[PDB]
Amino acid sequence: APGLVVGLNKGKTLTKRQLPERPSRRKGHLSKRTAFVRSIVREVAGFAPYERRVMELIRNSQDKRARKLAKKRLGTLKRAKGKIEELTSVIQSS
Amino acid sequence: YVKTWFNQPGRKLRRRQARQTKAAKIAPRPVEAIRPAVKPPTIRYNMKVRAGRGFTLEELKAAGVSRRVASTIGIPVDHRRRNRSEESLQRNVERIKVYLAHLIVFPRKAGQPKKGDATDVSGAEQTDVAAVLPITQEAVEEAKPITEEAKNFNAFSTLSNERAYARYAGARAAFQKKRA
């Protein structure tokens, strides 16, 4: 804020006070309890066929096809990349 | 279909009797609750000051009253609003402070003063809150001297080029990361 109207600093020049963090923003945070529960359900429930198919695609280094196929299954790139990275961590964990 | 307004005097009289009946129902306490001093959110109206919904949890914490006591004694609380400029902290604070100063709380359970509510009770009076607590507009300045350093400040040196600087900041930043 240069006491002015324009620029990538613009605004009326004041002393901003550091506002506290509100509990609504807490969403998405991991709980060791729920992280444990998700571990249990992952180990007991298993996997749907489509992630099964893509993981030996990672196993035989068929990465690009698996990424495209994961995109087709879910719909968005971020969901697809989020999927494959967690399966890969499962792959190295195994 | 065709909305006619032949009831306009009638509806106005209904509200009057609504206020008079409401006020007479709770006569000791003021008819209208207090509201904070808040600024309209846009470049057209941001200079003005108007009355908001309630005082944010920051202000009640500063004013020394809990969010429970405030609701009981007629101070509305707004949780959605958050106040960031510490003047908005301020301007609402003494607003709560002077409201508490002029506030008189009748003791519960047969008029034995509890904590610091009050001792006198004959001072029961129903007053307009905007009288004791009017909302003011922005304090404008008058008769300030010198600022010949701003004289040499030739406006567009900021406006014209910083506006261009803002416009070209993205392209400039892309340039710097490119040749790096």
Add this chain to the structure above:
Amino acid sequence: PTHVSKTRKLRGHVWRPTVNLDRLWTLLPNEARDKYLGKNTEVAPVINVLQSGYGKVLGKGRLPETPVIVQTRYVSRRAEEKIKQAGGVVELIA
């Protein structure tokens, strides 16, 4: 009124508002103009056009030679120089 009508004679016969320098001195309270215009006072009057719902101060008109500070958001490219030789100052509202 039907009686005057022609039917009663045919029976049978089938955001930036703008302010120019000729108007800044009209935005003062009249006592401010009375006691501050034309007097060689050390302190000059201050005009906040934004308080009259005006965004940009254009520069049309002549000025009295009394120094006066004008507070504004935007200003035309001649409106500032005219107030230079008017003895007053222009500084920009944030």
Add this chain to the structure above:
RNA sequence: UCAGUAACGGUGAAGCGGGAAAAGCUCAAAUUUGAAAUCUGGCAACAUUUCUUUUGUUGUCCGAGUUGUAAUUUCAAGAAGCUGCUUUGAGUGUAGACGAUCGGUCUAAGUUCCUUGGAACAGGACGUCAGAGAGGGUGAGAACCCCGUCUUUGGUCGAUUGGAUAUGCCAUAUAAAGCGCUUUCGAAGAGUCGAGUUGUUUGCAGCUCUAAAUGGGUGGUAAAUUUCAUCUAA
């Protein structure tokens, strides 16, 4: 009001501003495991009533319920440890005031003379009341014959009720809660969101696929990705 504006191609909003009115909240997601502390119903008593017609309480029994009834918590938070201030009933008769309604009751002064007329409520003379000269009736234009109108936001008399005021009696109160602090923990709603597809007026719906935890929705930005802002759906 924006505004017949944006948008669409005649249809046609919304944010902002002013005003009317304002009031906040409850669950699921964790335990109390040193006690299912919870709840319906049957039976015996105690009551209370707009009310013999209603509404409960106590005791006892039985069943419901650990595939979860209570207490605590709902993101504005909050839980668990620490601190010293503050507080507290889901009660019960009497008196007085306050209003709501109904039920009733109380409301000032010419019908005095002459003429016309079937009839005076007409015309004339002489008066009266008026917080009452709104209206209606009475054998024709009636303030004073009558009902009414005004006083009336009232006097009276019932009946209940409005909840406050005082008072009296029980209560149980070994109590719980608010806020300084945290040495931290924070669970947060799935055939749902979403994507493609078909219909219909972005919304919804059928169909196949089908999620995630700083994730997800939504936008200013960027860039086509990004930061940033704001909110926390099912």
Add this chain to the structure above:
RNA sequence: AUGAAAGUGAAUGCAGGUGGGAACGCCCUUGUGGCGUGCACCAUCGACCGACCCGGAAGUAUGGAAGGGUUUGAGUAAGAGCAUAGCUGUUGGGACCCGAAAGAUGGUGAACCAUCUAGUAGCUGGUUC
């Protein structure tokens, strides 16, 4: 106000002259005529702002000035509009009144009924001192 939009954003010259131009003054003391003055204006023009084109003083890649157009605007140039009522005209609502088969929805009976309907009316007829 201009520009498609970013964006910029209007007295030349007693806020002009150029001629003229209202009444007045103003007479030469008659009046006429002139002296004028010039309102609305009027035409012209000098110009003043935006767009268009050429040029880049500067000032923090950015950027703008001075200056050159006879290209542009129902532009500025000492604001004239706002509200209410009436008249008249026009557009839309049943739309001056009356009148065509038809069509839809839902019913009754073995075609009819009620609503939509006060329809399509480019016409026929009528339309008041």
